[PDB]
Amino acid sequence: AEHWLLQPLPEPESRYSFWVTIVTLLAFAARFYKIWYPKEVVFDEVHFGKFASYYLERSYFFDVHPPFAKMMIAFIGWLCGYDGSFKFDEIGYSYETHPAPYIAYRSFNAILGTLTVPIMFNTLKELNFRAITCAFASLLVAIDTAHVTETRLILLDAILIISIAATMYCYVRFYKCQLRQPFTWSWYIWLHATGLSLSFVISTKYVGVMTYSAIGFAAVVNLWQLLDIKAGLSLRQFMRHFSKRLNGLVLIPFVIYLFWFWVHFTVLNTSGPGDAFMSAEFQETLKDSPLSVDSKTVNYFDIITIKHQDTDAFLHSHLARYPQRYEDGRISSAGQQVTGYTHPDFNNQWEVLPPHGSDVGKGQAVLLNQHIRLRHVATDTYLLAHDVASPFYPTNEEITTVTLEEGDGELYPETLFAFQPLKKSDEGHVLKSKTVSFRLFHVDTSVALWTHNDELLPDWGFQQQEINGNKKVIDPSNNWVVDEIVNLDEVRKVYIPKVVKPLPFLKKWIETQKSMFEHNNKLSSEHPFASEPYSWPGSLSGVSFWTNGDEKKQIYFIGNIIGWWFQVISLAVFVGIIVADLITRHRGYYALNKMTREKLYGPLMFFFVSWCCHYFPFFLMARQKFLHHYLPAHLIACLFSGALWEVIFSDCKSLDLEKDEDISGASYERNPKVYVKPYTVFLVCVSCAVAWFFVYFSPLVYGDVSLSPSEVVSREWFDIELNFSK
Amino acid sequence: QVAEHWLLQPLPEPESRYSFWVTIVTLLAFAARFYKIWYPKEVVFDEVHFGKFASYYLERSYFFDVHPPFAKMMIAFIGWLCGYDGSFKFDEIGYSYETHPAPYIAYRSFNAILGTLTVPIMFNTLKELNFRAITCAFASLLVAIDTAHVTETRLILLDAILIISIAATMYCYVRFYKCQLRQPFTWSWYIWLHATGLSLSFVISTKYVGVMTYSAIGFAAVVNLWQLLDIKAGLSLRQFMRHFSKRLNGLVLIPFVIYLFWFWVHFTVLNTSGPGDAFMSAEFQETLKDSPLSVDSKTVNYFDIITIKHQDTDAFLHSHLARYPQRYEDGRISSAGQQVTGYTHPDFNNQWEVLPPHGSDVGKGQAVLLNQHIRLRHVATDTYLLAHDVASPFYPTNEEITTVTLEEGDGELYPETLFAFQPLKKSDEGHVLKSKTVSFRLFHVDTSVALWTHNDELLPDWGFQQQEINGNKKVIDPSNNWVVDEIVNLDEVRKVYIPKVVKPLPFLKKWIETQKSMFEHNNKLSSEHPFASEPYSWPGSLSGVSFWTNGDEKKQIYFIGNIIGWWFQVISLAVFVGIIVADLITRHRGYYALNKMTREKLYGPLMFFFVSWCCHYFPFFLMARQKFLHHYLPAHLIACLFSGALWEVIFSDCKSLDLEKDEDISGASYERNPKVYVKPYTVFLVCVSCAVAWFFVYFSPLVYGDVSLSPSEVVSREWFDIELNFSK
């Protein structure tokens, strides 16, 4: 496409500036519309918000994707002065109870999604297409429902898609500089800008290898043309092209990719949820967490305080006794009261004793799920649970205490407790203060100790929380932690500051990289929205991102079906045109003008092959896949479709059907007329249909409007299952 | 046209030299396949499947398989020629052919003939591509004495029929292409076109992997149609359309009719109900005649007295007046209830009356439906079958099965007497229960267990050494399967065998149903295999498959390629890619290193074999189902032709006359008869042949299974991921 791409622009710059401004303002309006809504965690915000928090805390985490895009999200949190306190644990968590800077994160993605549109516009402008063609192709991304939904939420895809758009643009700029004058300062700038953008693509997600393949193919095709003796280059000049492109497109981008891992390991210098994925040698490079520095192994004969996780109350006892009858007339034991108390005192102190007749001595660690006894230090009594109903809950057991003589006698079984782990995998691990949650499980009656703060004991229980034996052992509200060890040896009191051992960066990176590829290939899950590659170009199914049951509102991830089908038709029509051109030429019939062919076999073939690189490799992947994996291919299909329809509405005819205009010295029409009037009417009709669809699906893009069940069902077609259709 | 000047040359040697070498390599191939063909006198590997299918064809019993019928019908046809009746079932590996005489020597001999006849077809393929007689001999020798091709083609396997049909396809297509170059639309051109189509039909009618052979020939046929579409070919569009329509007919339409013909034969031979029925619709099964034996198989009605038989242990559900001991040997407490046991002999204590639930309007003579609640009354003790939350004698997690009195079972224990004949498939819920044909789980309604029994351990003296009957919590377990064997109280009107009225089904409907079932089960889900292997390991022959083992004699058959031969082919493929890349680079630079005739060999026959190898290798990387080393034998077969051809080219005078001039330009002078350096070429081929033959002899104990190896000799043959038996 040398003669086509070296032409002046087909229109004045003011027309391009007008249309790029309009489509950028539409893209801005579509992404920033109600950006504060929903005020809850949506979809994969549970992952990328959580990773932003771990960067701010400097806590080591593992993920299957490279660090760059997550560090960009974390960097916005850092600019907002966010500390990482909020964890984004589940979908539907309110941003009002724990203020994460979610508007700033969503706004950052909305900016990147908006800036993608003028990069797409300028890509076609640089390929010498008309301003209306550039506007239309960019509009197909500006008001696509899937591109809008993804680029307003705290997702990696806004950073991926802008980096792909920037890669395509920078490569087109590089290629025009290559056609005009190679080895100019501008040629080096655009080569290294293509490499930089390619680095950001692969540093966001490994699917970025498809963008390397697309640009790599185009760069190899152009290197082949420069290797031809007809190019007039010496082998030394060719080798200069090769070595400079290898440096700009492979070596420098690889150094920038490694730089993001170097930043990642320098920021994440504290032990965290990622430790389980790494070797002990890697974990030795991490500092102890600030929380772990105040943690200690619990031993037999340690005096401990036991704290409830949900109510912050301590397990407490005092010389007061349960009333012989509760207010409902049930009979209590008239035993010593065990209560939940929110203030630290001497009545919160329990000594951990081993079972009677055990060989277990002072300084041995308590293991999870081992039988223990708890002695209340202030009253010198054993903790006890029995078949007596609790004050407020007739089905739950009263928790009391017994004398040492009675508890070493007949009531011995009723004094047996265990620090039962929350997970069966954790049985037999060493109990530690502050870090190990457990259920305080009674061995004989099979209940867990529980407390609540919705109702307080009457005046006879000092308005303290009730402690009772809950029969629903698995209930997450039965969770306790050892808060303090009161009798900690001064040496034990002295924190043991792990000596951080250094690991060479390349060893650290190779280990993390192997773990990334192994976990990415080795993973199960399910996700009731996974989609095979054959369904993507049709947008035949989508993904539920968020639902509110009370308001009957939902966010649903789906493509603009009119826009996507228009692109499928465009791809099919182009294959038909190329096959027809090849057949007719093989018959000595030259239907198409040289300039039409330069558009078809240059920019359109470049986008078609680039789309193939972002679509067909997914048929070879056996892992879970989803519709969002097609957004890179759809982005290229928007450029392609805009370009194709300008060619179809151009004067494509050869001057002489019996003569090949590609023969050196043949006359050909250099400025094929575009039929602007019917072309503009056609583009307006398609744009109005795409805009109508975007408005019709806007309640599902924004989640901001409740739909009646009949309106929900009216948007269910193919394999689109929506919530609230009943 | 591609390689037109090369392929139109006279043969490089007299026909007597070709006749000499083809005879020698065919005699070697015969000797390698027929060596001890009677050994082992036992069922080996997949002989359990293909021997069994041969038996079902002879009995006319309907069976289902994931592969098309042609190759199995060829095996069955040898049995039919031997007067074999199909009595022997080939149920397991190691079953003796002496106790039940199947014509296994005749079946193995048929495959050994086909494996032997593959070798002269391969030889003649290269002869027709104008290669030297020694080149044809060497490429055919690489198949004649390959350990994998030998092992497969002497056992009762489909692969002998597949491989000869692929070899015949390649040969027939080369013959067709030479007729196309000389004079199109001759009688010989039609013969070879339809012979290519016929051979292609046999490939896809043997295994669906035969689509790779259609792709290889289809690509070559499209490339040649593309050359004939060229205005420079001098053909009118009418003459081109005549080529197109005749090739479409000979390579697609006729082969498809022959493929359908084998299914028509299959459904005409298999006209009786059989083990395949479970894979087909009731409408398909209505086209099958009943099985004679099942003349007494009949609808089970309420108030029928039945015997219930376990599928895996052949034991009947049995009960008697003896009681469980108050404590088992491990100290667990039993119910001290009446014993329910598995008994292998038919008696009066196997008799259970099928009763409807209490308060049902269901009368005598109404059919029992699958998954309906029922009660079972033991006829001899007048007690209801019961399951409860008491642990079984041997399995602490499984329930004890007992019986209760009528008064107690009609009282508080009523829920614990409720059973269902639970179908194996959810699709079969609400169907009529029938004796002998309908497998079910005997499901307890209250505790959600299935009745189960085993024969690895028998009850102690208090349980008369009978099988335990227990309530298995793993309901879905295939070992929980039961059948109604007999209806003891059957009325004379029902007793009279009811000759099912056979209903006709249109052939295309029958074929479409079977074909959908074939593809669904082939890509059903498969699993993992102690011998499954991935495509990347095949060209190296890095792992093999155990086919047979005898523990007493320490003998084994192991399926593996001739590693020297396979690595020589990998090197050959790599060298050719290097030659093509070097030719392309040098030409771009205006340097014409290679003579026109050398290029016609490289871009004609060698490229045809290279693309054909690619079609038989690379598509397996896109397949997510289980795969095995034998799937590469079609690609290896093509790689043998390729490697023989390539090394003749390397040992030829490949130089252009003028390195600055393209000899492909019209009117350029080129050397028409490039000299082969026959002396160093023959020494090279003899050295490689001696190495391949040495390897074949060294592995021959594992090909034939006929020699016991010491543990050190076994370990000396273990390399890479080759695990052999008796290494300890």
Q: To the nearest whole angstrom, how far is the Cα of B683 from the nearest Cα of chain A?
A: 41
Chain-chain contact of B231 with A587 (C-beta, under 8 angstroms): yes
Q: Please give the Cα distance from B166 to B118 (Å, whole number).
A: 9
Report which secondary-structure segment, H or E, holds B352.
Answer: strand B351-355
Long-range contacts of B505-511 (CB under 8 A, 24+ apart): B505/B283, B505/B284, B505/B286, B505/B287, B507/B263, B507/B264, B507/B267, B510/B267, B510/B284, B510/B287, B511/B260, B511/B263, B511/B267
Smallest Cβ–Cβ distance between B231 and the set A227, A228, A588 belongs to A588
Kindly list the residues from chain B whose CB atom is less than 8 angstroms away from the CB atom of residue A622.
624
> What single-letter DSSP state applies at residue B675?
P
Cα separation, A75 vs A92, in Å, equals: 24
E-strand stretches of A446-500: 448-451, 465-470, 479-485
Give the residue among B500, B361, B379, B386 at the shortest CA–CA distance from B434.
B500
SS3 label, residue A540: coil
Distance (Å) of CA A489 to CA A431, A454, B120, B606 = 17, 38, 90, 83
Query: Mutating which of A235, A521, A587 best tests the B interface, going by the most B Cβ atoms within 10 A?
Result: A587
Q: Taking CB atoms and an 8 Å limit, are B588 and A619 in contact across chains?
A: no
* Residue in chain A lying closest to B228 (CA): A586
Preferred mutation among B225, B228, B526, B589 to probe A, highest tally of A CBs within 10 A:
B589
d(CA B195, CA B671): 35
A622–B622 C-beta distance less than 8 A? no
How many Cβ contacts (< 8 angstroms) between chains A and B? 14
Interface test with A, best of B230, B237, B588, B621 (most A CBs within 10 A): B588
DSSP state string for A116-177: HHHHHHHHHHHTT--HHHHHHHHHHHHT-HHHHHHHHSS-SHHHHHHHHHHHHHHHHHHHHH
Q: What are residue B405's phi and psi, to 5 degrees?
A: -65, 160
Six-digit token string for A509: 């990176």
- The resolution, in angstroms to one decimal, equals 3.9
Q: Which of B588, B622, B624 sits opposite A227 (nearest CB)?
A: B588
Q: Is there a contact between A229 and B590 if contact means CB atoms under 8 Å apart?
A: yes
Closest approach of A616 to chain B, Cα-based (Å): 12
Distance between CA atoms of B184 and B178, rounded to whole angstroms?
A: 9
Q: Which of A170, A119, A202 is nearest to A638 (CA)?
A: A119
> What is the chain B residue with the closest CA to A621?
B622
Taking CB atoms and an 8 Å limit, are A619 and B621 in contact across chains?
no
Nearest residue to A338 via CA among A283, A401, A292, A279: A401
What are the helix and strand counts (H, E) for chain B?
A: 22, 14
Cα A122 from Cα A119, distance rounded (Å) = 5
Contacts of A25 (CB under 8 A, 6+ apart): none
Going along chain A from its start, the domains and CATH numbers come out as 8-266+529-713 (no CATH), 303-486 (2.80.10.50)
Amino acid residing at B580: I
List chain B residues with CB under 8 Å of A588.
Answer: 231
Q: Rounded distance, CA B375 to CA B616, Å?
A: 59
Residues of B with CB below 8 A from A242's CB? none
Q: Token digits for A500? A: 């951080």
H or E element in which residue A376 lies: strand A371-376
Angstroms from B194 CA to nearest CA on chain A: 29
Nearest-CA neighbor of A634 among A721, A561, A719, A529? A561
Tokens of B479: 């070992």
Residues of A with CB under 8 A from a CB of B: 227-229, 586-588, 619-620, 622
* Cα–Cα dist A397/A330, whole Å: 12
CA dihedral (A80, A83, A89, A90) positive or negative: negative
> How long is chain A?
726
* Cβ pair A228:B588 closer than 8 A: yes
Structure tokens at B341: 């046991």
Q: From its phi and psi, is residue B554 left (phi > 0), alpha (psi between -120 and 50) or beta? A: left
Three-state SS at B399:
strand
Q: What's the gap in Å between the CA of A235 and the closest CA on chain B?
A: 10
A178's enclosing H/E stretch is helix A157-180
Q: Which residues contact B349 (CB under 8 A, 6 or more apart)?
A: B318, B319, B320, B343, B378, B380
Contacting residues for A558 by C-beta, under 8 A, at least 6 apart: A145, A146, A149, A539, A542, A543, A627, A697, A700, A720
* B519 Cβ contact partners less than 8 Å away, ≥ 6 residues apart: none
Give the angle A278-A281-A284 at the CA atoms, nearest 5°: 100
Yes or no: say if B634 and B612 are a contact pair by the CB < 8 Å rule.
Answer: no
Residue A616: closest CA among A534, A495, A527: A534
CA distance B158 to B205: 11
Query: Maximum CA pair distance of chain A?
Result: 115
* Determination approach: cryo-EM
Separation CA B58–CA B38 (nearest Å): 22
Say which amino acid occupies A22: I
Spatial separation of the C-alpha atoms in residues A277 and A266, rounded to whole Å: 18
Burial class (CB in 10 A: 0-12, 13-18, 19+), A48: buried
Please tell me chain B's helix, strand, coil percentages from 3-state DSSP, rounded to the nearest 5.
50, 15, 35
- Shortest distance between the Cα of B226 and any Cα of chain A, in A, equals 10
Distance CA B492, CA B469 (A): 33
Residue A216 pairs with which residues in a beta bridge?
A: none
Cβ-nearest to A622 among B229, B230, B624: B624
**Chain B residues closer than 8 Å to A620 by CB:** 621-622
Residue type at A644? L
Separation CA A628–CA A644 (nearest Å) = 24
C-alpha of A191 from chain center: 30
Which residue type, as a one-letter code, is found at position A341?
Answer: Y
Residue A106 CA to residue A152 CA, distance in Å, equals 5
Q: What is the DSSP letter of B461?
A: G
> Please, how many CA atoms are within 13 Å of residue B550, restricted to the half-sphere of its CB?
20
The DSSP code for A704 is: -
Closest-approach residue (CA) in chain A for B619: A620
Binding-site residues on chain B for chain A (CB distance < 8 A): 229-231, 588-590, 621-622, 624
Contact B590 A228 (CB under 8 A): no
- Rounded to whole angstroms, the Cα distance separating A563 from B414 reads 65
CA nearest to B234 within chain A:
A587
Cα separation, B447 vs B468, whole angstroms: 19
Six-digit token string for B384: 């209801």
Distance CA(B525)–CA(A421), nearest Å, equals: 38
B483 Cβ contact list (under 8 Å, min separation 6): B308, B309, B311, B435, B436, B437, B438, B439, B440
- Positive or negative, the CA dihedral B695, B699, B703, B704 is positive
CA distances A159 to A150, A167, A253, Å, are 11, 12, 16
Distance CA A648, CA A646 (A): 6
Amino acid symbol at B670: Y
What burial class does residue B636 get, using C-beta atoms within 10 Å of its C-beta: 0-12 exposed, 13-18 middle, 19+ buried?
buried
Q: Phi and psi (nearest 5°) for B186?
A: -75, 165
Query: B235 to chain A nearest CA, in Å?
Result: 11
- Measured between beta carbons, the chain B residues lying within 8 angstroms of A234 are none
- 8 Å CB contact between B487 and B350: no
* Contact residues on chain A for B621, CB-CB shorter than 8 A: 620
Phi, psi at A620, each rounded to 5°: -95, -5
CA distance A462 to A371: 31
A229 and B621: CB-CB below 8 Å?
no
Contacts of B229 in chain A (CB under 8 A): 586
Round to whole Å and give the CA distance between B72 and B160. Answer: 11
Instruction: Say how far apart CA B441 and CA B357 lie, in whole Å.
Output: 18
For residue B230, the distance in angstroms to the closest alpha carbon of chain A comes to 6
The CA distance from A286 to the nearest CA of chain B, in Å, is 39
Chain B closest-CA separation from residue A622 CA (Å)? 8
How far apart CA A104 and CA A251 sit, in angstroms, is 34
B341 backbone dihedrals φ, ψ, rounded to 5°: -135, 165
Q: What is the dihedral of CA A583, A589, A593, A594, to 10 degrees?
A: 70
Does residue B636 sit in helix, strand or coil? Answer: helix
Q: How far apart are CA A201 and CA B390, in angstroms?
A: 63
Alpha-carbon gap, residue B699 to B560, rounded angstroms: 9
* Contacts with A227 from chain B: Cβ below 8 Å: 588
What is the rounded CA–CA span in Å between residue B717 and residue B699? 8
CB spacing of A227 vs B621 below 8 angstroms: no
**Do the bridges between strand A479-485 and strand B305-310 make them parallel or antiparallel, or are there none, so unpaired?**
unpaired
Cα–Cα distance measured from residue A237 to residue B275, given in angstroms and rounded to the nearest whole number:
73
Phi, psi of A300 (to 5 degrees): -60, 145
The answer to whether A269 and A287 are in contact (CB under 8 A) is yes
What gap in Å lies between CA A719 and CA A708, rounded to an integer? 20
> What is the DSSP secondary-structure string of A254-290?
HHHHHHHHHHHHHH--B--TTGGGS-HHHHTTSBPPH
- H-run or E-run covering A687: helix A676-702
| Residue B586: alpha-carbon gap to chain centroid | 47
Cis amide linkage into residue B10, ω under 30° from 0: no
Decide: helix, strand or coil at residue B301. strand
**B590: closest chain A residue by CA:** A229
Q: Which segments within A549-608 are labelled E, that is strand? A: 553-557
Cis, bond preceding B40 (omega within 30 deg of 0): yes
Which chain A residues touch B581 with a CB distance below 8 Å?
none
Q: Pick from B230, B231, B589: which is nearest to A229 by CB?
A: B589
Contact residues on chain A for B588, CB-CB shorter than 8 A: 227-229
Q: A499 is written with which tokens?
A: 């000596």
Helix axes A561-586, A631-648, angle to 10 degrees: 60
Shortest alpha-carbon distance between residue A533 and chain B (Å) = 14
Distance, CA of B700 to CA of B147 (rounded, Å): 8
Measure A219 CA to nearest chain B CA, in Å: 18
Chain B residues lying within 8 Å of A619, measured CB to CB: 622
CB contact under 8 A, A620 and B622: yes
* Secondary structure, 3-state, A58-94: CECCCCCCCCHHHHHHHHHHHHCCCCCCCCCCCCCCE
What is the C-alpha to C-alpha distance for residues A539 and A629, in angstroms, rounded to an integer?
Answer: 12
DSSP-assigned letter for residue B252: I
Q: Among candidates A402, A368, A358, which has minimal Cα distance to A383?
A: A402
Residues of B in contact with A587 (CB under 8 A): 231
DSSP string, B482-526: EEEEEETT--HHHHS-----PPP--HHHHHHHHHHHHHHHHTS--
Three-state DSSP at A367 gives strand
Nearest CA among A115, A196, A223, A127 for reference residue A162: A115
